[PDB]
Design a protein around this nucleic acid. Structure first.
Ligand code: GDP
Ligand code: CL
Ligand code: MN
Ligand code: MN
Ligand code: MN
Length: 535
RNA sequence: CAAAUUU
RNA sequence: AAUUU
């Protein structure tokens, strides 16, 4: 039936300047050599993304879907959800959020300037009074950094971001924010992925795995998921929102937003020209995450039922899921996954790479990450979250006139503190840099480098300073990644850490704390590492 | 552009 | 600020 997009032929213009690296990368030319492999998805490449995502869609539901959808509405109704005062919504706008066409930006909105507050009042009026006129949207390309992958086709084209003017975004929040805070958790229960910390995510997966008499696992991702979302899915999304206790004024707004924005509409490039028209998810609206997550969860749980997966235990984060099930033999498991996939494909949620059953937790990737295991200080198996380091490393070498990567070094050091690649590579580099800059005190993205041990033990457990004997998979993947980016191998980072460490220790103070906890892995005579006041 | 987590 | 979807 419905085509996902249609194109005037007008280009998808840049919303500013997209910078190139420079001939010297002073912060990261000691981290890695192959800077030619590090690129940022440009808006010229948007054209190609459009081609990939524009395609005709056909959807066939069935008892299993219908049934799941029923049960989900019954969940939805145990939820009461209130409107948000125009002001409260203004306050939830991000600091730098892209300004309005109508002469004002996020400063005004967050501070409750009167020009801003009136415009918004009017815009909300128009939603209440008018429930069909489509709402224009801007379309732009997302700029992300990756390592090239010649094996997987050279350079990814830029993903497409599609969003309404600022005023509309506030209104969206008024109508929907509270729902987003309550509905998913209530529809999906323990399956709701974003609810968990990474540690809980891991415990959850292990508990699921443990529960089975004979576990089988897989993950599923949808190809260009936002393109796969149909007018009907969105309307079914509305009817799920509506299934709550709502102020009548909300219902009108929801329904008006649904019909005028969410379900489709015209798109304009940043120079103002009509770009095309959209009949699927706009990734840019408030409902993007919740939408994707709920919808994905319906189709998924239906496919599970269509395919006979026994005792499924799910975890959904957007279009990404993991199911851990009771195995029915490999022969049947393969048949069921095929079924599952046909069902999803019928429901208009077809796979990128088609899924496969696995019987070992390490072999299941979702949200670009996976569980692995190493040994801790006393010889116990310690499970943790990790990932291919390619992209984080690539991003660690993204230096331009207007951008420093030091923050991403830190971001990843915190998030993946127990991973061998953070511990040996990223930390070593990060500290090495700052000691030489002599800018350790300096706060970065509101964090103090010298806190790190505390920060890390709070979030990952003191075991993160003592883990050893990492998995074959993980060593292979790390090695291979450094080799791919022309970084030094681990043996060299070992040396460099001994040095960094010695300097940090001899620096005294918190530096020495850092030097001792964070680099204890680097020494043959490893110390007794006890817990920290600060956490 | 939106959300979630981490800070 | 970082990351993810
Ligand atoms: N608003 C917004 N949504 C995103 C972004 N990245 C991913 N998503 C949403 O999550 C969906 C699934 O993500 P992913 O599997 O990573 O990409 P895709 O399936 O190729 O589109 C996308 O189709 C988007 O709707 C982003 O930067 N902004
Ligand atoms: Cl242990
Ligand atoms: Mn996907
Ligand atoms: Mn309605
Ligand atoms: Mn995904």
């Amino acid at each position: 039936s419905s085509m996902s997009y249609s194109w005037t032929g007008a280009l998808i213009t840049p919303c500013g300047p997209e910078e190139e690296k420079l001939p010297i990368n002073p912060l990261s030319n000691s981290l890695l050599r192959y800077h030619n492999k590090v690129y940022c998805t440009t808006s010229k490449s948007a054209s190609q993304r459009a081609k990939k995502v524009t395609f005709d869609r056909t959807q066939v539901l069935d008892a299993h879907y219908d049934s799941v959808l029923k049960d989900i509405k019954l969940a939805a109704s145990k939820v009461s959800a209130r409107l948000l005062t125009l002001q409260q919504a203004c306050q939830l706008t991000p600091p730098h959020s892209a300004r309005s066409k109508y002469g004002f930006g996020a400063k005004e909105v967050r501070s409750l300037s009167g020009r801003a507050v009136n415009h918004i009042k009017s815009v909300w009026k128009d939603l209440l009074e008018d429930p069909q006129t489509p709402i224009p949207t801007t379309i732009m390309a997302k700029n992300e950094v990756f390592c090239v992958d010649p094996a997987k086709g050279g350079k990814k084209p830029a993903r497409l971001i599609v969003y309404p003017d600022l005023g509309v975004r506030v209104c969206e929040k008024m109508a929907l924010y509270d729902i987003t805070q309550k509905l998913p958790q209530a529809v999906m229960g323990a399956s709701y992925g974003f609810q968990y910390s990474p540690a809980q995510r891991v415990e959850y997966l292990l508990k699921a795995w443990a529960e089975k008499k004979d576990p089988m696992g897989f993950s599923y991702d949808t190809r260009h998921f936002d393109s796969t979302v149909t007018e009907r899915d969105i309307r079914t999304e509305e009817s799920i929102y509506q299934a709550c206790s709502l102020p009548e004024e909300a219902r009108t707004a929801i329904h008006s937003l649904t019909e005028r924005l969410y379900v489709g509409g015209p798109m304009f490039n940043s120079k103002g020209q009509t770009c095309g028209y959209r009949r699927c998810r706009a990734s840019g609206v408030l409902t993007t995450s919740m939408g994707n997550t709920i919808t994905c969860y319906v189709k998924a749980l239906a496919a599970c039922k269509a395919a006979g997966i026994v005792a499924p235990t799910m975890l959904v984060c957007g279009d990404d899921l993991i199911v851990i099930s009771e195995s029915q033999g490999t022969e049947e498991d393969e048949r069921n996954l095929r079924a599952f996939t046909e069902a999803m494909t019928r429901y208009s949620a077809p796979p990128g790479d088609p899924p496969r059953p696995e019987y070992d937790l390490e072999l299941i990737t979702s949200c670009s990450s996976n569980v692995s295991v190493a040994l801790g200080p006393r010889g116990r198996r310690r499970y943790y979250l990790t990932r291919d380091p390619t992209t984080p490393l690539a991003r660690a070498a993204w230096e331009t006139v207007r951008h420093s990567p030091i923050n991403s070094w830190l971001g990843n050091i915190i998030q993946y503190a127990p991973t061998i690649w953070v511990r040996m590579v990223l930390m070593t580099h990060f500290f090495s840099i700052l000691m030489v800059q002599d800018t350790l005190d300096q706060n970065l993205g509101g964090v103090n480098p010298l806190d790190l041990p505390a920060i890390i033990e709070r979030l990952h457990g003191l075991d993160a300073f003592s883990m050893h004997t990492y998995s074959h998979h993980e060593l292979t993947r790390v090695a291979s990644a450094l080799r791919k980016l022309g970084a030094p191998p681990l043996r060299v980072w070992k040396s460099r850490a001994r040095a960094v460490r010695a300097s940090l220790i001899s620096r005294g103070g918190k530096a020495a704390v850092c030097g001792r906890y964070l680099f204890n892995w680097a020494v043959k005579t490893k110390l007794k590492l006890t817990p920290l006041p600060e956490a």
